[PDB]
């Protein structure tokens, strides 16, 4: 029977994380969204379907986003954040910057992560987002504006900008976002 179906290609090395021990992870995703998730181990492909026709698109789409987030490197616990209202997944493909250069990729990942993971944590704290630096993809989870702010900061670091430069810029962007939110709130109540 025809129904909405979202196919999600999963990195082979992450299929176990998506399924979870005894299938506990996919089971939990299914439980919270009202979806049915089928796994094709040989093709490392996951199919997300609604359990009933009345399951809304957002439930199906977010279930698929959680799977994509785990595939990208996020542990299930962090990926589940995508089930929350207004949370989205944004990805920065570092090869768009350094192409196929392994050495350049390693160097920029060093800048993005920072000594002791200080750079990655600073961006996460400033934007209130979860950031995962995978093989060559940096995945970000947060609301639209904050995720886009983090994306920009990550791109700036991948391009060689000083850390202080990036933080100062992010500071301006985030103070603007929060100020606007506070004013909208004040104005409403």
Same domain, 59 and 105: no
Find where tokens 């919270």 sit. 32
Same domain, 21 and 96: no
Same domain, 66 and 96: no
Same domain, 7 and 46: yes
Q: How far is CA 159 from CA 62, 109, 168, in A?
A: 31, 11, 16
Count: domains in the chain? 2
Please measure the distance between the N-terminal and C-terminal CA atoms of the chain and give it in whole angstroms.
49
Q: How far is CA 71 from CA 46, 75, 152, in A?
A: 10, 9, 22
127-130 long-range contacts (CB < 8 A, ≥24 apart) are 127/153, 127/170, 127/174, 130/74, 130/78, 130/81
To the nearest 10°, report the CA torsion of 11, 139, 35, 3: -80
3-state secondary structure the chain: CCCCCEEEECCHHHHHHHHCHHHHHHHHHHHHHCEEEEEECCCCEEEEEECCCCCCHHHHHHHHHHHHHHHHCCCHHHHHHHHCCCEEEEEEECHHHHCCCHHHHHHHHHHHHCHHHHHHHHHHHHHCCEEEECCCEEEEEEEHHHHHHHHHHHHHHHCCCCHHHHHHHHHHHHHHHHHHHHHHHHHHC
Q: How far apart are CA 117 and CA 112, in angstroms?
A: 8
To the nearest 10°, report the CA torsion of 34, 40, 44, 45: -50
Enumerate residues 6+ apart whose C-beta is below 8 A from 32. 80, 83
Q: Six-digit token pair at 61?
A: 């789409």
- Choose the final residue of a domain: 84, 112, 135: 84
Same domain, 122 and 181: yes
Q: How far apart are CA 149 and CA 45, in angstroms?
A: 31
Enumerate residues 6+ apart whose C-beta is below 8 A from 112. 119, 120, 133, 138, 154, 157, 158
Q: Range of 141's domain?
A: 85-189
Contact predicate 65/141, CB 8 Å: no
Q: How far apart are CA 189 and CA 183, in angstroms?
A: 10
CA atoms within 13 A on the CB side of 15: 15
Name the experimental technique: X-ray
């Amino acid at each position: 029977a025809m129904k909405p179906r979202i196919y999600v290609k999963v990195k082979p090395e992450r299929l176990g994380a998506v399924i979870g021990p005894r299938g506990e992870v996919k089971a939990e995703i299914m439980r919270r969204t009202g979806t049915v998730i089928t796994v094709d181990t040989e093709n490392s492909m996951v199919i997300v379907e609604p359990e009933a026709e009345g399951i809304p698109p957002v439930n199906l789409m977010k279930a698929a986003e959680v799977v994509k987030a785990i595939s990208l490197g996020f542990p299930p616990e962090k990926a589940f954040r995508l089930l929350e209202e207004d949370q989205i997944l944004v990805v920065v493909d570092l090869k768009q910057v350094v192409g196929d250069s392994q050495n350049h990729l390693k160097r920029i990942k060093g800048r993005i992560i920072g000594e002791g993971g200080r750079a990655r944590r600073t961006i996460e704290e400033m934007t209130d987002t979860y950031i995962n630096v995978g093989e060559y993809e940096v995945a970000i989870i947060g609301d639209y504006e904050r995720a886009m702010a983090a994306k920009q900061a990550i791109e700036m670091l991948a391009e060689g900008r000083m850390h202080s430069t990036v933080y100062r810029h992010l500071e301006r962007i985030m103070r603007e976002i929060k100020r606007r939110e506070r004013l909208k709130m004040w104005a409403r109540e």
